[PDB]
């Protein structure tokens, strides 16, 4: 058999990957790059085999020929006798979150406010809200809609990076990896929690997992769910219990991609690795947990219960869905 080479985005992911590699007896080894796009390039060169991707990045990877292998499956909402690995994925709800105290703010008054995004090119942080905003404004000048933002991966001198904070030292402002304080789901929610932004584009789970003691992280440990509201597309504001009726979109779950020629090997190795290190895995929590990283969603989202098999051997367009692919394509016409 062959070893599988995972691609870690940034140094925190690299550290977790190295622990995984050690624990797996080098069945998995690590390549690292500074951004998700550069990891996608390492895979296209054959210098890494695989990584797990948000759906917007799956679109970039899929245009370049890489294929989905296994998808994240989180805790099911409904009763299922199906094993996690065989359960169909349900998608997650992209939402726009504001502070309840910022009382005039709705979907229809977002112009010139400050925004927090997971990163450019990700589903809930970018493709869904900016695709909606382009469409509703009739303008491609989405870089002039919010007065200032943190949108990791944008030009660091531009308004879209003005709120990003970089690392402990203030280096790497706006880089699209976990070194940037406001990167990703939890970074973008922290950007709103600290009132750096007026609105965060994240998903429903983010708000629940970082409030009401669900996180003990310093910035999160005192946040209360009732101090947030979701913005609905009809201009109303709801409590964060109502995400099923006040979301922007339903997103396809993050998923592992690989070259087509290494997908079956990558699949087999991952099914075995999650049996050792997954939720209830033989060696988790004793030795290593693949789907934990103290809330920082490194390599995989912390709320992943397993990686699940895909039905229909889907192409990337099948896995993302036609409507979403079409939405991304429309937005990318602007740049």
């Amino acid at each position: 058999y062959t070893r599988v080479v995972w691609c870690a985005v940034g140094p925190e992911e690299q550290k977790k990957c190295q622990q995984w590699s050690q624990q797996s007896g080098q069945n998995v080894t690590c390549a690292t790059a500074s951004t998700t796009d550069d990891c996608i390039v390492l895979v296209l060169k054959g210098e890494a085999d695989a990584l797990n991707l948000d759906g917007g990045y799956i679109y970039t990877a899929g245009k370049c020929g890489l294929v989905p292998v296994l998808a994240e499956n989180r805790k099911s909402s409904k009763h299922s006798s199906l094993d996690c690995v065989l359960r169909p994925t349900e998608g997650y709800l992209a939402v726009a979150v504001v502070k309840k105290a910022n009382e005039g703010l709705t979907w229809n008054s977002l112009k010139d406010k400050k925004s927090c995004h997971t990163a450019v090119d990700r589903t809930a942080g970018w493709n869904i809200p900016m695709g909606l905003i382009v469409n509703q404004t009739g303008s491609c000048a989405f870089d002039e809609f919010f007065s200032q933002s943190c949108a990791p991966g944008a030009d660091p001198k531009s308004r879209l990076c003005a709120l990003c904070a970089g690392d402990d030292q203030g280096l790497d402002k706006c880089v699209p990896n976990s070194k940037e304080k406001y990167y990703g789901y939890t970074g973008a929610f922290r950007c709103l929690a600290e009132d750096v932004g007026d609105v965060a584009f994240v998903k429903n789970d983010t708000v629940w997992e970082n409030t009401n003691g669900e996180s003990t992280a310093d910035w999160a440990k005192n946040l209360k769910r009732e101090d947030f509201r979701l913005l609905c597309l009809d201009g109303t504001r709801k409590p964060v219990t109502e995400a099923q009726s006040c979301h922007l979109a339903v997103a396809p779950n993050h998923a592992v991609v690989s070259r087509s020629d290494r997908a079956a090997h990558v699949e087999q190795v991952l099914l075995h690795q999650q049996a050792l290190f997954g939720k209830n895995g033989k060696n988790c929590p004793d030795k290593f947990c693949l789907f934990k990283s103290e809330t920082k969603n490194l390599l995989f989202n912390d709320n992943t219960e397993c990686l699940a098999k895909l039905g229909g051997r889907p192409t990337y367009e099948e896995y993302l869905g036609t409507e979403y692919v079409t939405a991304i394509a429309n937005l990318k016409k602007c740049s």
Binding site: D37, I40, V41, L44, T60, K63, C64, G65, A329, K332
Partner: peptide
């Protein structure tokens, strides 16, 4: 809506 971006 066609080629690889790299």
């Amino acid at each position: 809506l066609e080629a690889c971006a790299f």
